Design a protein around this ligand. Structure first.
Ligand SMILES: O=c1ccccc2[nH]c3c(Cl)cccc3c12
Length: 347
């Protein structure tokens, strides 16, 4: 018997379609999962609108983290009252049968689902530009000094369409988020979207979100993750295939440097040594983004050959922007304000 038979063995609330809470919320159905718990679709009889309700796990550590989430959402929504900065709206929260319940506006499906709808053909560079511009603008919001918020888990599943016919988006799931002052985890971000500084055990700031976004935009256009590591070692290696060996001034300050690399007597770094003539990775920097994107060959896989809004010049700009976002150095990685000024976004 977990929580008088309301929970399961994983601290999640056993959801029941048609159930009605507090003479207010008619529960329609389950529509999301996460480490945090579950999200359900519900009708709010009082306000007379569909909502989404995040049902946090009934367990101390989860509840505590969700309380941080709430603080940051409420802090964001208070600045963005007009709802023009692409951040989901927290309508209210309540405790119900020992679970914290967060009530958000209802939204459509996420960008992973959108990619899946084209059978991972990827979406157009025109639509990619639109998502890029909205996300940079959202990331600029988070960068306002009074917020200074690191989302910490950007990925396609956490960017959602407002409406399925339209290109407007909102960022959701601030359940791993923190402010620039109060950083509390070392192992953060979804692995494909994890920055080098986090892989390397280093301190991190808002620039980890920009890294993640760089990875996201490429995926939105090619249909597959740019760096799809099966574990941290594979991840770091896949980054090195495209961008080369991280600079020495970084690896010299990196606690986990020796998990992936070796420092030679003359002070330079290589990939850690490999057994018995085993070969698995392309040599450093030889997996060119130029080729991944199909800059001069009709886009990714040649699938955009002779389509408008997919010229070579369009791609060269896109590529340039993406490499600025994937700068190894967090201090020089492009920041939201300057990203919006990039030639990729020219009217
Ligand atoms: O915060 C989330 C986290 C994870 C997974 C799914 C998810 N769907 C949502 C919808 Cl429709 C509205 C608002 C939030 C979400 C949400």
């Amino acid at each position: 018997v977990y929580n008088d038979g309301y929970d399961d063995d994983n601290y999640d609330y056993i959801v029941k379609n048609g159930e009605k809470w507090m003479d207010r919320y008619e529960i329609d159905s389950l529509i999301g999962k996460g480490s945090f718990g579950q999200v359900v679709k519900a009708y709010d009889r009082v306000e007379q609108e569909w909502v989404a309700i995040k049902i946090i796990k009934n367990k101390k550590a989860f509840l505590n983290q969700a309380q941080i989430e709430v603080r940051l959402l409420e802090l964001m929504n208070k600045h963005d009252t007009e709802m023009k900065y692409y951040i989901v709206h927290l309508k209210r929260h309540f405790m119900f049968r020992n679970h914290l319940c967060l009530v958000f506006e209802m939204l459509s499906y996420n960008l992973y689902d959108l990619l899946r709808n084209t059978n991972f053909r990827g979406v157009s560079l025109n639509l990619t530009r639109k998502f890029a511009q909205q996300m940079c603008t959202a990331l600029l919001f988070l960068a306002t000094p009074e917020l200074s918020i690191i989302h910490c888990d950007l990925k396609p599943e956490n960017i959602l369409l407002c409406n399925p016919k339209r290109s407007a988006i909102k960022i959701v799931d601030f359940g791993s988020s923190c402010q620039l002052g109060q950083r509390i985890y070392q192992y953060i971000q979804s692995r494909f979207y994890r920055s080098p500084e986090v892989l390397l055990g280093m301190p991190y700031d808002l620039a980890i979100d920009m890294w993640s976004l760089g990875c996201i935009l490429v995926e939105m256009h090619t249909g597959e993750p740019l760096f799809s590591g099966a574990n941290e070692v594979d991840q770091m290696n896949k980054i090195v295939e495209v961008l080369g060996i991280p600079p020495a001034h970084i690896l010299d300050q990196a606690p986990k440097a020796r998990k992936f690399f070796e420092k030679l007597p003359d002070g330079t770094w290589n990939l850690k040594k490999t057994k018995d003539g085993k070969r698995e990775y392309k040599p450093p920097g030889t997996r060119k983004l130029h080729n991944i994107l199909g800059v001069e060959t009709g886009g990714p896989g040649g699938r955009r050959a002779g389509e408008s809004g997919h010229t070579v010049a369009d791609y060269l700009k896109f590529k340039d922007l993406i490499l600025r976002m994937l700068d190894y150095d967090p201090k020089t990685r492009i920041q939201p304000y300057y990203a919006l000024q990039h030639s990729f976004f020219k009217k």
